[PDB]
Design a binder for this molecule. Structure first.
Ligand SMILES: Nc1c(NS(=O)(=O)c2ccccc2)c(=O)[nH]c(=O)n1Cc1ccccc1
Ligand SMILES: Nc1c(NS(=O)(=O)c2ccccc2)c(=O)[nH]c(=O)n1Cc1ccccc1
Ligand SMILES: Nc1c(NS(=O)(=O)c2ccccc2)c(=O)[nH]c(=O)n1Cc1ccccc1
Ligand SMILES: Nc1c(NS(=O)(=O)c2ccccc2)c(=O)[nH]c(=O)n1Cc1ccccc1
Ligand SMILES: [Cl-]
Ligand SMILES: [Cl-]
Ligand SMILES: [Cl-]
Ligand SMILES: [Cl-]
Lengths: 297, 297, 293, 293
């Protein structure tokens, strides 16, 4: 007998094959900085914004130690970070089999370690997904090139009616973004997946399984949000310029984990002050210091 | 006797002195494009988002005809556009004396013709300002360099308690943005202003007058909004790159007046189709065409 | 012998509308200065002081207002209009009386160049008293341009304007040096199938006689693209990154006039006054007392 | 006589942290390729095939993994470590046995160069069998660098490292050519007040004997800044704008090896295979059948 009487995060950061070689020969894409910080800070900060404190980072065997050196066990930021390896890039849905013991009987959320988001009320957008305990929640976002993505088709009433992975003739311009919230059904659904035509375990098949059960919520992520492309060297550069323009204008940083932990009340002023000390001689540490004596609405 | 029984817009687009010379020797700043469209499209689109259909464009004598050629009388976009000249750059609050006959007994809103905004729920942010019929509404936005702006000081409860124009030691990092909503008190307040130390009629003195009457609402424009700097050649370039990254990612345009009029139901599908015809051979006209047969949430 | 310059700054049509609905592309700035400063600076660097600016009927007065007669910068500027965009070769019909019996050079008003020894690359073109000189430059999209084909020995053997199947990746740049033959060649041109008097036909005229020098503008040079919104932006970011790293401006005509000895220390000082309170005037004042090699 | 190359790719400290917390700056890409490809390409362009790469203890194995022994690219690469950032002059102590009795050249691992005839600017430096050659370049912020002062006749008369009051806007670039004297000069260096064995002291050693050639790297050259987050970004956008306009890559070592005749058509074909499905491999295959001037 079980007794009745929260949600766990996973970041998939398993590199990018040979696609961005030779730039990425020496290091994983998700460790490349976007402007002033490692790329993985952005998706990590996204889970943190969602209220998620227990997080599994999945990376290659080769680069797990570098992620561990960067991020540690999470204790500096009021988190618990665990690590797992992905020996072979067999697809996104593999995160649930690799993370099966990590997930246990809890709800979960998956984010791609190369996905950057920005916008107003993002916290509330994520909170509504997080609070849907049952079913799956995903986000749809209008893009120029939906053929590159999982694409969501809507009826005249706005109801999601189909999902297609990289269709040659997209039914809409609405791509499914790399942020996914799941209930306790996901690991079993994932265990029963067959590899696609490309020998790959597809997240879109998972989401379609939920859709078929009538348990997929598709929330629109509106045009006033920025979901930044990191798929090409060109988009990477644009991502960096975007973040720089925002931060240099505002004097506020996007996806600074120290700050988000501090505003979530996972760390206090004294602990924030300690995290500042080692980087006091650069703008990043000076930024952390300033946050101790400024009200930011 | 009067009988009881809406809001009018003004765009101040009077160039920028010799500050950006020689770039601006041949044309007004507010006619320079930001990426794919004239700069003035952005603030105009902002008033339109606010529901404002009756709009006065104030510019130099020299460049009024170029604005008129670009924008016409507004009828193509379901607007009414009127024009006035500013012979001498005597300051922002002068818009109310120049626009006194235009404003009549109505509520009003002023936007700077070089101010660009972007973000999620911007429509709702503007709608709440617009619906406050009484008093004045402005927006405060965290910036790196508040000393360049009107700066708003808040007490521990978040109440605005003072305003200072370009203080050497800012009380906060919260700048007052170039978007202002006013009731019928503004023209009289403006008529009674004395020129500042720089022989200039200050908008901050207007706003302070409302603050002193207890009739200033300061709404925070949060960090997830982008209020883009156009004060320098460097910021202008960043503004252009920002818009380009957003539009090329999304396949949706920022501050396309044809689109906003169409979504506000100020023009119909047949009229939108006609506006598309003359630019059918470029991406702008092709964009307008696509909007006729796509649902965009 | 004298060589006169022509800048063609005509219309880009509706192709960049609405950004260019109010004013022509070449009057807009690239970063910190009007686009036209860059081609003008190019001719000045080539040692050319007598220059005809050709633009649309609507915008010629505004070019006249921006640049004047040139005497502030040691130049002798004149102006003319191209009523319709009927081809680049039309520059020599419009500018026939301006050219007279002199050598000539044509630059396109939206073309930006940069690199080391640009002065000497131009000087060597300017020095050829006979024939015509053009520059070929490797580009990813040669189909947009006049395309030069070379034999195995490096010799130019053909030119095709916007070929559907380009013979090489070498584009002819928007800078052309001609001898006294070009007017008579241009006045015999017939309109092409797309309806224009083609500069590539003028160039093929010289090529058929062995009198077209096609010099390679190497990859260490920047010929920046201004044909799209995207490329206009890249040009702004390119000039800004160079200028902010070096503290030296690209295509500042006051500076170029001063280094050519066309204006003196005193005259550059007067030019610095009006913009003393901004970066451009500050730059020009610094030129008075800094040795730049 | 043989000239050997050294690339110093040491630590930037905590100054770019956290972006560089996980891995050193010079292993990160600039646009499409690892930063270190650019300085390596610079030495290769200078005709140097025997090259010692010096990095931090933690990252040397990763440079070893990226570049191998060099034989795929017609190079002979070796590796060594700088345990602590105790000065650029330390390169010659670490690399003493590597250098032996040969001429040498040092490039900083985070320095990017671009422009026309860069090959000939380097070649002329390489050809000087005696003394030392450096390059001076006008910058807005000379206080960050080794600063060269010139008399009215153009002669270098002093060097100051990071002066509070710089004597000119001319910075010494991160590229240095030395004769057989440099090791013996470096082994006599004492640490400066900031605690480093200074390359500027090595250069002043040559200057005191009339044996420092200070050549001007002109404004038509790009020496890009990689010292800040802002400048790293500008470098990426600068390389991208050049490469996308031209269809030609800056500092592709496979290409440079191929043009130097250090690898043949067959060997470049093998190098193209692994990345055939992306832009880099496609670029390299195209080099086999395209004449680029
Ligand atoms: N809004 C925000 C953002 N902006 S965001 O919502 O667009 C964002 C958060 C996390 C990752 C990427 C973007 C941020 O980077 N850092 C923050 O500290 N905040 C403030 C914040 C932090 C925590 C809870 C609610 C609000
Ligand atoms: N949201 C939006 C935007 N984005 S915005 O709110 O950030 C904005 C609007 C106007 C000017 C600048 C930004 C836009 O450019 N064009 C649009 O058509 N829209 C959609 C829209 C149009 C009209 C009413 C409500 C929503
Ligand atoms: N080289 C240079 C340049 N650089 S350039 O040759 O790449 C260039 C010249 C003109 C237009 C665009 C670029 C410049 O902007 N302004 C300058 O004063 N010079 C210096 C100069 C001036 C006059 C003669 C020879 C060299
Ligand atoms: N010029 C050039 C360049 N341009 S460069 O001289 O500005 C340069 C070389 C090396 C590193 C950075 C820039 C290049 O990237 N790759 C090349 O193959 N070349 C051509 C080349 C190759 C070998 C010898 C002489 C010229
Ligand atoms: Cl939205
Ligand atoms: Cl916000
Ligand atoms: Cl070259
Ligand atoms: Cl030069």
């Amino acid at each position: 007998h079980h007794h009745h009487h929260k949600r766990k995060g996973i970041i998939l950061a398993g590199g990018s094959g040979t696609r961005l070689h030779p730039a990425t020969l020496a290091i994983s894409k998700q460790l490349l900085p976007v402007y002033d910080k490692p790329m993985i800070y952005y998706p990590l900060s996204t889970l943190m914004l969602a209220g998620i404190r227990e997080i599994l980072i999945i990376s290659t065997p080769q680069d797990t130690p570098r992620f561990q050196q960067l991020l540690g066990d999470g204790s500096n930021w009021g988190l618990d970070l665990q690590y797992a390896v992905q020996p072979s890039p067999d697809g996104l849905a593999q995160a649930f089999l690799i993370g099966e013991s990590f997930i246990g009987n809890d709800l979960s959320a998956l984010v791609l370690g190369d996905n950057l988001y920005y916008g107003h009320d993002f916290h509330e957008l994520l909170g509504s997904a997080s609070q849907r305990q049952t079913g799956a929640s995903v986000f749809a976002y209008h893009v120029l090139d939906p053929e590159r993505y999982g694409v969501v088709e809507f009826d005249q009433g706005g109801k999601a009616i189909s999902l297609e992975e990289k269709p040659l003739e997209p039914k809409s311009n609405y791509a499914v973004t790399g942020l996914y919230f799941y209930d306790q059904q996901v690991v079993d659904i994932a265990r029963d997946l067959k590899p696609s035509p490309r020998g790959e375990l597809e997240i879109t098949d998972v989401n379609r399984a939920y859709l078929e059960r009538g348990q997929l919520s598709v929330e629109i992520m509106g045009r006033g949000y920025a979901w930044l492309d990191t798929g090409t060297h060109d988009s990477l550069l644009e991502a960096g310029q975007f973040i720089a323009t925002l931060e240099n204008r505002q004097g506020l940083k996007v996806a600074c984990p120290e700050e988000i932990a501090y505003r979530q009340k996972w760390i206090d002023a004294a602990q924030l002050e300690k995290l500042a000390a080692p980087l006091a001689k650069n703008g990043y540490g000076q930024y952390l210091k300033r946050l101790l004596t400024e009200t930011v609405y």
